[PDB]
């Protein structure tokens, strides 16, 4: 127990990816195109390859829900190009999502641990 | 390492439910209608409620893939009713699926443990 939120199966890829993107913004390291390559490089060891569309999708929802905003700066040696940094518009809302996602994760952990002990 | 199989995200509900149904058949306790109620009663503590359609679906696929078969017996005090027990048609194939599912589960475990250590 803690604050409810705890019912369901596991977590969706999109919800998984949003969590990492929130933390990456806290560390000042969520840059636009550059993101899919840093996200895939993060899970290569475990064998997870983030889906191209789930990545682009999670990001737009974080923008459209008003948690992130984008800092754009025109690239000097390139017409029609811009460096994109992501920052918080609503850090409290981001802080909520992270809180609510720990409860999903601890339940996932217990579910997988249950399945492993019951079946083998 | 062990025998490969190890790439992807987590596991689907259907694949999760098939594992439990394989083990339940090993213990001579997979009875037809009775199943959804025993499957839900198994995860109430953790907060997982098996979807009605995922259950009926996993079961038909286990039948149609040729891993299970059904032993039917007519109920004596009921016309058009029958007791249904499930048994293996192909235990080696069932034994394979279980082998292949342990590799998915151990990867899930490591993925959730990663997410928990990185983000909090």
UniProtKB/Swiss-Prot annotation, chains A, B:
One of its GO terms (biological process) is DNA replication termination. It holds the Pfam family RTP. Keywords: DNA-binding. GO terms for molecular function: DNA binding. Plays a role in DNA replication and termination (fork arrest mechanism). Two dimers of rtp bind to the two inverted repeat regions (IRI and IRII) present in the termination site. The binding of each dimer is centered on an 8 bp direct repeat. Homodimer. This is Replication termination protein.
């Amino acid at each position: 127990e803690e604050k409810r939120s705890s019912t369901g199966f596991l977590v969706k890829q999109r919800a998984f990816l949003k969590l990492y993107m929130i933390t990456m913004t806290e560390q000042e390291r969520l840059y636009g195109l550059k993101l899919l390559e840093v996200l895939r490089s993060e899970f290569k060891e475990i064998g997870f390859k983030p889906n191209h569309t789930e990545v682009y999708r999670s990001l737009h929802e974080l923008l459209d829900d008003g948690i992130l905003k984008q800092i754009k700066v025109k690239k000097e040696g390139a017409k029609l190009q811009e460096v994109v940094l992501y920052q918080f518009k609503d850090y409290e809302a981001a802080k909520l999502y992270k809180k609510q996602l720990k409860v999903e994760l601890d339940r996932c952990k217990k579910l997988i641990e249950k399945a492993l002990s019951d079946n083998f």
